[PDB]
Design a protein around this ligand. Structure first.
Ligand SMILES: C=C1CC[C@H](O)C/C1=C/C=C1\CCC[C@@]2(C)[C@H]1CC[C@@H]2[C@@](C)(O)CCC=C(C)C
Ligand SMILES: C=C1CC[C@H](O)C/C1=C/C=C1\CCC[C@@]2(C)[C@H]1CC[C@@H]2[C@@](C)(O)CCC=C(C)C
Lengths: 11, 238, 238, 11
């Protein structure tokens, strides 16, 4: 779930 | 007088905004071109790009990165459209009642947004919000603090650590009040006015969410959106 | 000599292709512009648009619309990339080893496709397939029949009514053989050659699916795709 | 499931 969001919230 | 901890907060937020708001609008040429729901491809690309910027800003807000991934997502899904409406004020023009982002290709009026599905039920309060916001003549410090306060609202669905988010928001609110009192001449009624705009955004978010359901439920329109717009304006829960 | 039922099939397929393949490439200006994974936004928009065309063609194939929605989807998800590769031959040029769709902006070489993520492991057999396909000098009747045979292959994962799909494909194959024998001068080895190209497409589909997983697994790349590309090249089962 | 595909396969 929320694949793009999780990735963009990384570093 | 303002303290060092309050100053460092302002410094961090202005830096965050300067790193995420491109005043040249140079990337707009990379979007699907505007057509004058002919405007939906261009405005979907505009919103998606703006979402990435809102993510970039939020990560630079002191304390936001310390929240759980689930709290970070809950805040963004609920506040993204409101941050977009706030940050769009920088391109808004009282003379044209339109958002101007470079050439006439990237100048959006009320009619361009109706060609993206949407109605005057959203666009009339939105233009009226943009005019009222522009009229406040906010310093950049106030503008970035309002965006950060809006994003860190603990009264959003899906939010778990209400206490921590509320303590982060309370601290930002104190910074704003003290900034207005000391640095904004004749700003005695401004903090109250800025907080009213936050309430106006909740109403605009409600109307947008209602209208969004209308296009998201028609696959011929929803297919024109971007995967990021679908995920962020989506109804999925962590 | 060819019968009326076989002729009506050819008429339906040529009509279907003329209604779905725009020789002017006029809609290409509506895509995110090409950048020389800089090419991924433009080529994702190109593939998505081509998928809509493949859907339009398939619906006009006699018998396809009579299949269940689940069989129609299973066929399209499995064959879409192969139909795209087949229909792209119409823009392919032996002189440049590139697909030319109007101006130099819409001329795609091997390098443009590497800037969309992808490698020579796919692009070298694909260009070699395009050259071999172009060299066959197919009449439009043969080209549209090969696309329809490719789309109606019953040996695709997810397919339920294998019998009906096989009977539709067998009938199309008979139409092609009879067309080549009667209307294609010196085409005695052509049917065998066209069937070999169908086998080449299975290998190109395999390599593409492998490479697609690589970009679909990196959300910074997958977010650049369209919702239709994600759904059609997706791994979801009815 | 297959929201866009189902809609495009209609009329
Ligand atoms: C997004 C920015 C920030 C950067 C720049 O200042 C330009 C700007 C303009 C924003 C606008 C002008 C067009 C319509 C929008 C973007 C409205 C803000 C909200 C509104 C909506 C309601 O139409 C968005 C929803 C529409 C979609 C998803 C197609
Ligand atoms: C799609 C058409 C049909 C209409 C016209 O004749 C033009 C054309 C060109 C197709 C090409 C030239 C660019 C790269 C593609 C489109 C390749 C066909 C397959 C290949 C791939 C392998 O790169 C597609 C996968 C790429 C994605 C999803 C970005």
């Amino acid at each position: 779930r929320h694949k793009i969001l999780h990735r963009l919230l990384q570093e | 007088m303002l303290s060092d901890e309050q100053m460092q907060i302002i410094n961090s937020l202005v830096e965050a905004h300067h790193k995420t708001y491109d005043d040249s609008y140079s990337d707009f040429v990379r979007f699907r071109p505007p057509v004058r729901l002919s405007m939906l491809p261009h405005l979907a690309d505009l919103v998606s790009y703006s979402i990435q910027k809102v993510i970039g800003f939020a990560k630079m807000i002191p304390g936001f990165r310390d929240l759980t991934a689930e709290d970070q997502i809950a805040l963004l899904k609920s506040s993204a459209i409101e941050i977009i409406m706030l940050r769009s004020n920088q391109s808004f023009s009282l003379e044209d009642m339109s958002w101007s982002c470079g050439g006439p290709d990237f100048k959006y009026c009320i009619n361009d947004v109706t060609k993206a599905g949407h109605t005057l039920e959203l666009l009339e309060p939105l233009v009226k919000f943009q005019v009222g916001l522009k009229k406040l003549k906010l310093h950049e410090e106030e503008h970035v603090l309002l965006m950060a306060i809006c994003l860190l609202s603990p009264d959003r669905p899906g939010v778990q650590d209400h206490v921590r988010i509320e303590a982060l928001q309370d601290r930002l609110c104190d910074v704003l009040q003290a900034y207005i009192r000391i640095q904004h001449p004749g700003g005695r009624l401004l903090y109250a006015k800025m907080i009213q705009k936050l309430a106006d955004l909740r109403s605009l978010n409600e109307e947008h969410s209602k209208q969004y359901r209308s296009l998201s439920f028609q696959p011929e329109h929803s297919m024109q959106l971007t995967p990021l717009v679908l995920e962020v304006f989506g109804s999925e829960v962590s």
